[PDB]
PDB file of C-alpha atoms in Angstrom:
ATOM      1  CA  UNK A 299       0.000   0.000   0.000  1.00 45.35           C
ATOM      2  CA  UNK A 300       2.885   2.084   0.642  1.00 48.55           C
ATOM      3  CA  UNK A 301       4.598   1.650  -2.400  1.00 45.88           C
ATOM      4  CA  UNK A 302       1.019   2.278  -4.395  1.00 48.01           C
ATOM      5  CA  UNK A 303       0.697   5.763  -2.751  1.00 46.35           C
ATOM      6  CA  UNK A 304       4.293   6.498  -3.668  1.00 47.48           C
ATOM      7  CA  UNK A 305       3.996   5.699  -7.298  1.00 47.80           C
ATOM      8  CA  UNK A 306       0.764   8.232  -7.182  1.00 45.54           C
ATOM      9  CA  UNK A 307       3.659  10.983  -7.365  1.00 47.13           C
ATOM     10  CA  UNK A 308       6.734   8.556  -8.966  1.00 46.59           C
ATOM     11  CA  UNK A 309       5.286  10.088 -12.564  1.00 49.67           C
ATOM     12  CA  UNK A 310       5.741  13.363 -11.741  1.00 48.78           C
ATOM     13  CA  UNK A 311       9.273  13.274 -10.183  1.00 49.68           C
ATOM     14  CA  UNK A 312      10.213  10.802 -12.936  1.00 48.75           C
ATOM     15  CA  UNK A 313       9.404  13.496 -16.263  1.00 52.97           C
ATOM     16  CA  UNK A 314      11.198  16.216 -13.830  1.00 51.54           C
ATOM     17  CA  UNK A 315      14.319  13.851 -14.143  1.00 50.06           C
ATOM     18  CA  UNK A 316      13.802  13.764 -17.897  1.00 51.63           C
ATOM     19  CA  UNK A 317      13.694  17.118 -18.380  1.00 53.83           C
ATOM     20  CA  UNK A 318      16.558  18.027 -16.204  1.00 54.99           C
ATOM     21  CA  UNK A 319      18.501  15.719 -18.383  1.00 57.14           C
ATOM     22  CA  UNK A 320      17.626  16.969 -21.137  1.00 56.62           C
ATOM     23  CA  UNK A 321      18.486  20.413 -20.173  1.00 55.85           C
ATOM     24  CA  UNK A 322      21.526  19.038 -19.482  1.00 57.03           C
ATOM     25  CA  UNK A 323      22.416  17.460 -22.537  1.00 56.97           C
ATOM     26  CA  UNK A 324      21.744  20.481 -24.427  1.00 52.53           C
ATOM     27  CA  UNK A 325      23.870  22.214 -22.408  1.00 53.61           C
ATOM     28  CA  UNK A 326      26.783  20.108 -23.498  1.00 52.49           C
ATOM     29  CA  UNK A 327      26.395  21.334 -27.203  1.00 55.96           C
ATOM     30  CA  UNK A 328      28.506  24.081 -26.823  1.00 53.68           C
ATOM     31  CA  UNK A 329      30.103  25.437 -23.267  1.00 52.72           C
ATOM     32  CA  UNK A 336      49.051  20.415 -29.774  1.00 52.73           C
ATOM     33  CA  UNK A 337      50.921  20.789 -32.710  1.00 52.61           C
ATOM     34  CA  UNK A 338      47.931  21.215 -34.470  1.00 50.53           C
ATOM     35  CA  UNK A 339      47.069  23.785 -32.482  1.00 49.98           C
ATOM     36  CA  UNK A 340      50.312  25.733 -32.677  1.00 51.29           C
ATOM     37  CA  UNK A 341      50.154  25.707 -36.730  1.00 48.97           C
ATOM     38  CA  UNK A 342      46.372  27.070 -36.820  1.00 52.56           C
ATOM     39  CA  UNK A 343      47.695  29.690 -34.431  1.00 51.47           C
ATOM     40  CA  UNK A 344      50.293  30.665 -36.498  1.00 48.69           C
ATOM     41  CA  UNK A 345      48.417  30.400 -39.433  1.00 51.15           C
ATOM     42  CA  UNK A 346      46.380  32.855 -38.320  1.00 54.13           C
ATOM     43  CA  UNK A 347      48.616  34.935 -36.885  1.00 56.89           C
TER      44      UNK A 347
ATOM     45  CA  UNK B 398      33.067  50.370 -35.637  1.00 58.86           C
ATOM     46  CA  UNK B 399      32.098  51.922 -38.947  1.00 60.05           C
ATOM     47  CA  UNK B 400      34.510  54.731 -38.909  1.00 55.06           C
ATOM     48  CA  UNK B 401      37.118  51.472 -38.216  1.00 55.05           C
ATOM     49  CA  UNK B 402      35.860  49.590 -41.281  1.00 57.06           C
ATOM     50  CA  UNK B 403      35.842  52.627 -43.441  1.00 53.72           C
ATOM     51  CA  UNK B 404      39.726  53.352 -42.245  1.00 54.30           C
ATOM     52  CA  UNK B 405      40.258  49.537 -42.949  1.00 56.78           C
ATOM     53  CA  UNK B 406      38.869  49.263 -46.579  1.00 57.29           C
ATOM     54  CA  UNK B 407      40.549  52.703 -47.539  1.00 58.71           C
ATOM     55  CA  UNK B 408      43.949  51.300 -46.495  1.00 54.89           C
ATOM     56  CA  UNK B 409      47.275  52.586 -46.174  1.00 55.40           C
ATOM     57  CA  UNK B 410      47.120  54.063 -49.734  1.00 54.47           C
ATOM     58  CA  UNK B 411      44.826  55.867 -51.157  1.00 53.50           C
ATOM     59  CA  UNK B 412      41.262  54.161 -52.131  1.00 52.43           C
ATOM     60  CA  UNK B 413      37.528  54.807 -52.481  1.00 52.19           C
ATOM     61  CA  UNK B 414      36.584  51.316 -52.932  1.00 52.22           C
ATOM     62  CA  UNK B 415      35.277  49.337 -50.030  1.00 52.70           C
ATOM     63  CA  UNK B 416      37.255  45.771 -50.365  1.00 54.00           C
ATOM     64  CA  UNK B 417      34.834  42.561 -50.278  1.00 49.75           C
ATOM     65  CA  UNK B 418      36.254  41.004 -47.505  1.00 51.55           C
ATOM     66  CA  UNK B 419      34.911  43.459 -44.954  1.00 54.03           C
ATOM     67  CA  UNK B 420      31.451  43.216 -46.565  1.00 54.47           C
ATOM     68  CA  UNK B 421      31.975  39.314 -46.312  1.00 54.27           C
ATOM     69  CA  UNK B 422      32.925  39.383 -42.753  1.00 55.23           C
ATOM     70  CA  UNK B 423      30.404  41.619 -41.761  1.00 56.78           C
ATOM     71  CA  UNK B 424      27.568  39.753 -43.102  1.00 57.95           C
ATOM     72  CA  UNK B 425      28.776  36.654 -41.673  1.00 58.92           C
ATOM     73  CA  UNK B 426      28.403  38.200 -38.211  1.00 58.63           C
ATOM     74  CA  UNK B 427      25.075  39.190 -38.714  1.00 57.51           C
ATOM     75  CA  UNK B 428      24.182  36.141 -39.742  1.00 56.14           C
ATOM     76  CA  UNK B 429      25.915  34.350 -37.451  1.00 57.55           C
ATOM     77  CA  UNK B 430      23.292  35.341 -34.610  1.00 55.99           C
ATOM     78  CA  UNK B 431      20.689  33.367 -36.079  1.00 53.53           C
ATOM     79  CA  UNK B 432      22.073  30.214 -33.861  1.00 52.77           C
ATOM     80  CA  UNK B 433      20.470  30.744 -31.017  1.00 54.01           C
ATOM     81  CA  UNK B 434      16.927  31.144 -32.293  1.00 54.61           C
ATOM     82  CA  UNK B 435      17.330  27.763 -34.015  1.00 56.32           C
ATOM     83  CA  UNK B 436      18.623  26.188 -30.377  1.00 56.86           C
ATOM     84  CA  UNK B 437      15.290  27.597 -29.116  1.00 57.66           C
ATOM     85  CA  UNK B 438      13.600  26.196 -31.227  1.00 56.90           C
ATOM     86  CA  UNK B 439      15.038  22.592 -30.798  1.00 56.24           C
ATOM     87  CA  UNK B 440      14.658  23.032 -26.944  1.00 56.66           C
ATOM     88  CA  UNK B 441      11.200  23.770 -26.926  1.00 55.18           C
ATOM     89  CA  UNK B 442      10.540  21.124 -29.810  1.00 55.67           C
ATOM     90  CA  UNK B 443      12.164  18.667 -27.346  1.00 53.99           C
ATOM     91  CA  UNK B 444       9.788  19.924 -24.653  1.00 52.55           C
ATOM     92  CA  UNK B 445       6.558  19.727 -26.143  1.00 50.81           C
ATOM     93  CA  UNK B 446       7.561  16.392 -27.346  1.00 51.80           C
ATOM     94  CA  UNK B 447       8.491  15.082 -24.100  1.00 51.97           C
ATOM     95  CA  UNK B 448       5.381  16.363 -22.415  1.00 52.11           C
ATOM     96  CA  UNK B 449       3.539  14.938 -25.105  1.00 51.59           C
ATOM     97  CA  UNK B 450       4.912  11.889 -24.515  1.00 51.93           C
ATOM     98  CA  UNK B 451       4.357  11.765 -20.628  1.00 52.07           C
ATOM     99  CA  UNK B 452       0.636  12.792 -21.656  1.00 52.45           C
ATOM    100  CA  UNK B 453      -0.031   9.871 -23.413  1.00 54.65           C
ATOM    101  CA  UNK B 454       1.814   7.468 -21.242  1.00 55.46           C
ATOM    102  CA  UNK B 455      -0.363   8.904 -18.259  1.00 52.40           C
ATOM    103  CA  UNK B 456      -3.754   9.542 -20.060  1.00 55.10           C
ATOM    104  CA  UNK B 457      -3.763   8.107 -23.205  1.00 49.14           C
ATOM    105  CA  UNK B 458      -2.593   4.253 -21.949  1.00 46.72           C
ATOM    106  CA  UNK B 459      -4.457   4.034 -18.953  1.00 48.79           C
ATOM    107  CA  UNK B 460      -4.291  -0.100 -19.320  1.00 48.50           C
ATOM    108  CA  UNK B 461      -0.176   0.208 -19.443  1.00 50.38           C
ATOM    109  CA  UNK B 462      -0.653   1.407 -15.967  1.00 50.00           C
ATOM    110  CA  UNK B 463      -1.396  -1.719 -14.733  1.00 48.02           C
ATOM    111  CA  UNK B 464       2.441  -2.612 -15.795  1.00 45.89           C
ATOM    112  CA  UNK B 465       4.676  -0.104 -14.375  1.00 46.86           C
ATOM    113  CA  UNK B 466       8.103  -1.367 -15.408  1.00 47.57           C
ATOM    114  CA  UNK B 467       6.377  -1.951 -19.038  1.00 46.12           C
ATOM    115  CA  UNK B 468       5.993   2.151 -18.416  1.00 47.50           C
ATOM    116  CA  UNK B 469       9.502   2.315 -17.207  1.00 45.61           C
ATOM    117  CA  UNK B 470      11.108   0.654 -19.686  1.00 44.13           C
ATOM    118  CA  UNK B 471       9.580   2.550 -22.680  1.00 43.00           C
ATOM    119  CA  UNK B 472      10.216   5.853 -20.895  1.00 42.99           C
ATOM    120  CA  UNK B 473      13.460   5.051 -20.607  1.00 42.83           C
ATOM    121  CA  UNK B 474      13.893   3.622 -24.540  1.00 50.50           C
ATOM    122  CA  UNK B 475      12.440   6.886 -25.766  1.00 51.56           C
ATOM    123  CA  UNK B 476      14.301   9.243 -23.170  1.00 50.93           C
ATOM    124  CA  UNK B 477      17.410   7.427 -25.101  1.00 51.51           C
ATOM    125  CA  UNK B 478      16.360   7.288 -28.451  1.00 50.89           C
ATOM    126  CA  UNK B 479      15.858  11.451 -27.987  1.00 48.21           C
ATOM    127  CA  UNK B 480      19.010  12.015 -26.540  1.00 45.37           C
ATOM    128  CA  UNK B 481      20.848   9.609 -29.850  1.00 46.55           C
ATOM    129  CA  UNK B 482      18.882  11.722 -31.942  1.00 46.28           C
ATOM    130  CA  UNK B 483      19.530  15.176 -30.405  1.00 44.40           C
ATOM    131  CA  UNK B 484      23.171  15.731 -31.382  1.00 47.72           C
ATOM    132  CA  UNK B 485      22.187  14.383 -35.002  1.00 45.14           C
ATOM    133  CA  UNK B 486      19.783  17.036 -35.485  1.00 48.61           C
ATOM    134  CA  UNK B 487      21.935  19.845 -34.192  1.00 50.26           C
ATOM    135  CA  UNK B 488      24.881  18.731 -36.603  1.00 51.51           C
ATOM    136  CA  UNK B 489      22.160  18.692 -39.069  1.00 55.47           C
ATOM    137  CA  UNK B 490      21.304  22.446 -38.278  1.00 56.64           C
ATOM    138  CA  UNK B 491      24.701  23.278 -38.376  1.00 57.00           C
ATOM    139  CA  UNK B 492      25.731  21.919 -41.509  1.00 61.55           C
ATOM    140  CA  UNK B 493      22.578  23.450 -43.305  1.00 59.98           C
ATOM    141  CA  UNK B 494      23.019  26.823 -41.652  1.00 59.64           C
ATOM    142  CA  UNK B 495      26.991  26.649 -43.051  1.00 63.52           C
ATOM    143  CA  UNK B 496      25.502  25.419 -46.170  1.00 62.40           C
TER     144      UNK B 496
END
């Protein structure tokens, strides 16, 4: 009985997870001697 | 900053003729602030599908209720299959906006 009242909210806190994951995610799309020749390159 | 392009495209010697390149770059600035309304879009896209999604889990399969980790499990297949999916269609977006 316990478990049946707590899954009454489990939906809600469940699509709160999603979307701070997803927030997340999309977050992450944008935040050597290779490097040194495309400095100097530009340079 | 226009008085600075103007001194740029006149150069050192004497010119009337505004050089291309400033044009070029100038243009590609502009046009480079069109990102973010495109990764507005995408977010809220990915929103309204997601709620739509918990909608009709909820609602719209009442009889799946009676199998939470049925629920579960295809929650968590489509959760993945939009976060595959998500970098695709921003490198999409990207390579037609640098089209």
């Amino acid at each position: 009985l316990l478990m049946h009242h707590i899954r009454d909210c489990l939906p809600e806190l469940k699509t709160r997870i999603n979307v701070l994951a997803a927030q997340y995610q999309s977050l992450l799309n944008s935040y050597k001697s290779a490097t040194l020749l495309q400095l100097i390159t530009k340079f | 900053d226009i008085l600075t392009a103007i001194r740029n495209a006149t150069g050192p010697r004497p010119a009337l003729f505004v050089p291309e390149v400033s044009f070029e770059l100038l243009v590609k600035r502009q046009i480079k602030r069109l990102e973010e309304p495109s990764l507005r879009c995408v977010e809220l896209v990915h929103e309204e599908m997601q709620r739509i999604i918990q909608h009709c889990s909820n609602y719209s399969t009442q009889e799946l209720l009676r199998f939470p980790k049925l629920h579960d499990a295809i929650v968590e297949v489509v959760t993945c299959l939009l976060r595959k999916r998500l970098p695709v269609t921003n490198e999409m977006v990207h390579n037609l906006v640098a089209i």
